Structure 1
Amino acid sequence: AVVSTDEYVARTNIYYHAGTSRLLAVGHPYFPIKKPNNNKILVPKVSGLQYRVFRIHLPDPNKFGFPDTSFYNPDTQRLVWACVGVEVGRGQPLGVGISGHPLLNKLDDTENASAYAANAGVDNRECISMDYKQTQLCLIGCKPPIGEHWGKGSPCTQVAVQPGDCPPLELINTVIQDGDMVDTGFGAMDFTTLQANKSEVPLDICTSICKYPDYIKMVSEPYGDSLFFYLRREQMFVRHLFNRAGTVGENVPDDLYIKGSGSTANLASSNYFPTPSGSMVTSDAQIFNKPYWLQRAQGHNNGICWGNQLFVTVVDTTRSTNMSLCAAISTSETTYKNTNFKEYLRHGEEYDLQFIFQLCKITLTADVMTYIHSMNSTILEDWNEDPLKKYTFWEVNLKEKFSADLDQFPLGRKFLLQL
């Protein structure tokens, strides 16, 4: 049996404030800039379609330098930090960003014809681009966020295929790491393995995984340690409608229509896909830059930063606008000249994490002691290998950032005017 941390946790009236003065990221919107031969990234991918998963490091209270230590008993009760205030500061102008591919598998427009189209010269791919689904979302937990996407989940043992017989899909749950790819409107899934074509979706994603947060499974989580706060805001629509060029993988059944004549007697690809478009971004609808008061929570854990760890997962499209820049090869020329300028694409991203933490304690009884055990062994052990080694989050160290006086910060100032 599980129960509200509000049971076994005690809350004190000691509040601290904490926040990275201003994070920054700058890169290239689709792919990483590395050496021609070497594999070192002299510039990294940085788009507004990557989930920024921050890992907040919190000082052990159990050792923190408190100006007083009467509020608690070092012998029976140990201290836990607790979150109540989070505000995910974004500091970039709202705009939209565009992604694309030089060789997009796109046959012909299907939105509206005027004549059954022509024969694909073999290879018909073309250069087209779009504006991905708008997705604004933030997740807070003391455990990493868990997404989902499709993929190929090695077969049923029988007919080990004739190269081609389409992939076994299989829902795959996974840890959302900083850097992963949001849904963009083409589903969530593994492009690198579902699409051998290597060119059915813009440059940034065709080589990646498009992950979507398994709310359902996270909320279904017992201890409710995954996320306790979270707010999503996603919206997209059909902009164009297109046809996948390529061979027929499965044939349209001959009972669904009737044969043609010459032109109409050879069927055009009946595999259509549409490009998405996250409509107009609006200020009146920002999730960020807005304070989230975590006083209560439908889940059992309620802001108990077990492990002194905090996981903030943000995904923000509204300020995706990647800028281009070009530089000249020589200042001589008096006349524009196509091969006299080099063109580049970059994208910035300005973050500003804000936090308000509540000091707590927990006297360790028998049933206490066993629960904290039966829940997370480490908590007791730690209390005085890393399962998160295999993962990569944006690491944040807030240990020398805590401050008691919220009278000196924007986020306390407000938190103080609420409670």
Structure 2
Amino acid sequence: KVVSTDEYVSRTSIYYYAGSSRLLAVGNPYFSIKSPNNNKKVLVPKVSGLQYRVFRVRLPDPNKFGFPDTSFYNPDTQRLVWACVGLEIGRGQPLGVGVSGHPYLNKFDDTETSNRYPAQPGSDNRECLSMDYKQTQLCLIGCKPPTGEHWGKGVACNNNAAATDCPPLELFNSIIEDGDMVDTGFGCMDFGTLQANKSDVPIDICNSTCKYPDYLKMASEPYGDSLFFFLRREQMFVRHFFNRAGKLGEAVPDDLYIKGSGNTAVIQSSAFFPTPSGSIVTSESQLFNKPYWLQRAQGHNNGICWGNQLFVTVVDTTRSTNMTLCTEVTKEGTYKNDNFKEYVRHVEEYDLQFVFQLCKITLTAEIMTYIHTMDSNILEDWQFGLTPPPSASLQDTYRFVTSQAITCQKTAPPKEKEDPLNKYTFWEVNLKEKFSADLDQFPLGRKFLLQSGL
């Protein structure tokens, strides 16, 4: 029954450029820090390269953009809705990869070339050990925030309980927040609730859970809200191998070996694990700084951004060299250990460019009740059917809004906006001021006029 979007959306020839002036982000690459008086006061936020820096944008409503010209379009029969025909996710920071770690990683011994029997026993053997990532890049668009999967703990039935101590596992689905973590090559599960030792993952994901998108679920939707165009590239290879220390859960059956004697009489551990390590980067395999042009999207919503917003989710681990700093305590003539404090930092620059298109739909009987199916909210904010009248009644505002003892309204809202995305955080960028009807004075205006022949 579902139809593609070229059958009720018409198109015309009034293009528009948008600019999204240079964004930055500075912070600590490892965690965040709070104030000792109030832990709800942030001091330095956690910004590294390994987070889904998803930007939701805002659009001007195309009904304010208008005059009483009716021969073009009659405003009680038609409506207007935008379209996306370009992209350029620019990043103006030079290359290089940074490495993270954790000061108390579990490590029994190595397993490369020699594990002489027997082993040396000890209670604690947690060490500091630095360890890099899995190099990856991807890009993704969408009129709805993209979903994602990860492995999560579920509820267990307690009837048989014959012989197991490992708790089983379940699959979840959620919506990706900014600041969520990405894969590093160590699966995609929780890393706060399934790890009592707190000492197997580097400190960036020592507490949080990482998510990884599944392209199966979002594309298999009827409308394909979560996709327009997506890319993917990653590569990794193992460099070193170790085994965990501690009491392993289930022993191996005895018949699969020979019972040793003496120093080999006691069994060792076998909980092996590798390290992921990145290969060379180049500047021939970068998914950025080049203008994509969506000629035909993959799903059904081919170009239309419903409700005047769209979501852009970028991640890169090739522009993430950990910026390192230091300062001074006391001066000397000779050298000293204790004259210096040091600090780590990381900055990650961005840019976004867009080229949009004007597209009017008509609105008759069956099209009014087709758009009244997919969602409901996209026919309230068009204000076409007068289902809410009472917006034209005036509400009182106040001079001297803050700290007066008059009667206060310090963000106690009686539901004005009601966006269901309010529960989640998002790096936001406003575009409500920065259109232009003239293209060629801007960078993607010139790349579009050459590619179209105009």
TM-score bucket of the superposed structures, by smaller chain: over 0.9
1:275-326 superposed Cα distances (whole Å, 9 cap, x missing partner): 1012221111110112121121111011211111110000100101111111
Amino acid at match of 1:351: Y
Amino acid at match of 1:170: E
The TM-score with structure 2 as length reference comes to 0.88
Residue 391 of structure 2 corresponds to residue 358 of structure 1: no
Q: In the alignment, is the contact (CA less than 8 A) between 2:57 and 2:429 conserved in 1?
A: yes
Q: In the alignment, is the contact (CA less than 8 A) between 1:167 and 1:194 conserved in 2?
A: no
Partners of 2:156 and 2:94 lie apart in 1 by 47
Residue 72 of structure 2 corresponds to residue 71 of structure 1: yes
**Cα displacement (A) at 1:117:** 5.5
Moved more, 65-74 or 98-107: 65-74
Q: In the alignment, is the contact (CA less than 8 A) between 1:173 and 1:214 conserved in 2?
A: no
- For residues 363 and 259 of structure 1, do their structure 2 counterparts lie closer, same or farther at Cα, with a shift above 3 Å needed? same
Which position in structure 2 is the counterpart of 1:158?
Answer: 159
Moved more, 96-105 or 153-162: 153-162
- For residues 66 and 151 of structure 1, do their structure 2 counterparts lie closer, same or farther at Cα, with a shift above 3 Å needed? farther
SS at match of 1:10: coil
Q: Percent identity?
A: 81
**Cα displacement (A) at 1:165:** 2.2
Which position in structure 1 is the counterpart of 2:225?
Answer: 225
Report matched runs for 1:257-406 at 5 Å: 257-330=257-330, 332-384=331-383, 385-406=418-439
**Cα displacement (A) at 1:254:** 2.0
**Cα displacement (A) at 1:148:** 1.0
SS at match of 2:38: coil
Moved more, 97-106 or 119-128: 119-128
- What is the number of equivalent residue pairs in this alignment? 417
**Cα displacement (A) at 1:262:** 2.7
Q: In the alignment, is the contact (CA less than 8 A) between 2:118 and 2:264 conserved in 1?
A: no
Amino acid at match of 2:43: L
Runs of 5+ consecutive residues of structure 2 not aligned to the other structure: 384-417
**Cα displacement (A) at 1:160:** 8.0
**Cα displacement (A) at 1:161:** 11
Which position in structure 2 is the counterpart of 1:127?
Answer: 128
1:187-232 superposed Cα distances (whole Å, 9 cap, x missing partner): 1111112212111110101111111011111111210111111101
Partners of 2:97 and 2:205 lie apart in 1 by 17
Partners of 2:37 and 2:160 lie apart in 1 by 41
Moved more, 405-414 or 260-269: 260-269
**Cα displacement (A) at 1:257:** 2.2
- For residues 97 and 184 of structure 1, do their structure 2 counterparts lie closer, same or farther at Cα, with a shift above 3 Å needed? same
Amino acid at match of 1:101: H
Normalized per residue, the structure richer in strand is: 1
Partners of 2:69 and 2:118 lie apart in 1 by 80
The structure number with the bigger radius of gyration is 2
Partners of 2:71 and 2:87 lie apart in 1 by 28
Residue 255 of structure 2 corresponds to residue 255 of structure 1: yes
Which position in structure 1 is the counterpart of 2:87?
Answer: 86
SS at match of 1:273: strand
Residue 214 of structure 2 corresponds to residue 214 of structure 1: yes
Which position in structure 1 is the counterpart of 2:406?
Answer: none
- For residues 66 and 45 of structure 1, do their structure 2 counterparts lie closer, same or farther at Cα, with a shift above 3 Å needed? farther
Residue 159 of structure 2 corresponds to residue 174 of structure 1: no
Partners of 2:347 and 2:213 lie apart in 1 by 24
- For residues 161 and 313 of structure 1, do their structure 2 counterparts lie closer, same or farther at Cα, with a shift above 3 Å needed? farther
- For residues 371 and 120 of structure 1, do their structure 2 counterparts lie closer, same or farther at Cα, with a shift above 3 Å needed? farther
The TM-score with structure 1 as length reference comes to 0.95
Partners of 2:155 and 2:71 lie apart in 1 by 59
Runs of 5+ consecutive residues of structure 1 not aligned to the other structure: none
Which position in structure 1 is the counterpart of 2:16?
Answer: 16
Q: In the alignment, is the contact (CA less than 8 A) between 2:227 and 2:298 conserved in 1?
A: no
| Match of residue 407, structure 1, among 434, 440, 450 | 440
**Cα displacement (A) at 1:153:** 1.5
Moved more, 259-268 or 73-82: 259-268
Deviating 4+ runs (over 4 angstroms): 65-70, 159-162
Q: In the alignment, is the contact (CA less than 8 A) between 1:108 and 1:117 conserved in 2?
A: no
**Cα displacement (A) at 1:417:** 2.1
